[PDB]
């Protein structure tokens, strides 16, 4: 759903543009009017105005019918993200405890075997950090939770 | 005479199970056309009504009711059920129901306690 809510965020970014494009069409639907009363010989590949205005109206209607609808049903997504970030916090606490236990600060340990153990720790810690940042970014993108 | 009556009381009659399933489908589906969002809803109602009637029978057997709702778009329909039980006391009934736009097959199994 992250990617999904990404597009959800994306579609909000389009809304203004929609209005923008809409008014362009408005200005467009004015200018092309002059086109017929300036006696223009319309080319065949030239698509005609009513075609695109109808399909664009249908475009806006379908978008505001289904994207909006799928946007309200986000509570399940809300609780999914909530439990995901609780799991992230739990794993962060587990990693904190693992770090406190695993401290190789003593020099009696053979340096490179402790280096590889710390490398395994850093790999799983990087995965934990990736999970945390992904959950935070999904939360702020969805922005309802 | 009493033994036959007791056996019929304790026997899995296919006719009444089929009638129960048909009534459940009629009450939950009836003449309604197919919508993708309420398939869960009719499947739940059909199975619930069927199991409720079957347990209202009081007839001493474990019940299994499965419902498959399919749409008339050229999709092929095949439901096969071969099982292992005691044939003398355990039974089954498959009810296949149609409207202008939907298949609905409900399979009911009754097994000895």
């Amino acid at each position: 759903t992250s990617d999904a809510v990404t597009f959800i965020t994306y579609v909000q970014s389009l809304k203004r543009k929609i209005k923008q494009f809409e008014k362009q069409v408005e200005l467009y639907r004015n200018g092309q009017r002059l086109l017929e009363k300036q006696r223009f010989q319309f080319p065949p590949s030239w698509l005609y105005i009513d075609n695109i205005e109808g399909e664009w109206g249908a475009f806006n209607d379908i978008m505001r019918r289904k994207d909006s609808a799928i946007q309200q049903q986000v509570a399940n997504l809300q609780m999914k993200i909530v439990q995901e970030d609780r799991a992230v916090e739990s794993r962060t606490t587990d990693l904190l405890t693992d770090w406190e236990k695993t401290k190789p600060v003593t020099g009696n340990l053979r340096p490179e075997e402790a280096l590889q153990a710390l490398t395994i720790y850093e790999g799983k810690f990087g995965r934990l950090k990736d999970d945390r940042e992904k959950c935070a970014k999904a939360k702020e993108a969805l922005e309802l939770t | 005479m009493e033994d036959y009556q007791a056996a019929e009381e304790t026997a899995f009659v296919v006719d009444e199970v089929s009638n129960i399933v048909k009534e459940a489908i009629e009450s939950a589906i009836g003449g309604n056309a197919y919508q993708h969002s309420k398939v869960n809803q009719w499947t739940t109602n059909v199975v619930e009504q069927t199991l409720s009637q079957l347990t209202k029978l009081g007839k001493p057997f474990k019940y299994i009711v499965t419902c498959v709702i399919m749409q008339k778009n050229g999709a092929g329909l095949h439901t096969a059920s071969s099982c292992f039980w005691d044939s003398s006391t355990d039974g089954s009934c498959t009810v296949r129901w149609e409207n202008k736009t939907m298949y609905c097959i409900v399979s009911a199994f009754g097994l000895s306690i």
């Binding site: 590949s45 698509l47 075609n51 695109i52 109808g54 399909e55 | -």
Partner: protein
């Protein structure tokens, strides 16, 4: 050739086969005088070309409300002949 300029009054379609609709309706109109047979020829030609199934009407004084397949709807004019062709079914 009678230059019947086409103005397409509604479409959800690609432009190439919209002009294909224009040309095919031009040929059908030049070939037949029966509006029924105009629809016959245009509909058969499209069913043959881009795989069935369409529905075509030709008339003068008409409205119609339709659900069609995406990229599979056209409604234009040739001369005084309103021509509609959509795909659904």
């Amino acid at each position: 050739m009678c230059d019947r300029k086409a103005v397409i009054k509604n479409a959800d379609m690609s432009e190439e086969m919209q002009q294909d609709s224009v040309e095919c309706a031009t040929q059908a109109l030049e070939k037949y005088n029966i509006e029924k047979d105009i629809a016959a020829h245009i509909k058969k030609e499209f069913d043959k070309k881009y795989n069935p199934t369409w529905h075509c009407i030709v008339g003068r004084n008409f409205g119609s409300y339709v659900t069609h397949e995406t990229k599979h709807f056209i409604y234009f004019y040739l001369g005084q002949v309103a021509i509609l062709l959509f795909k659904s079914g």
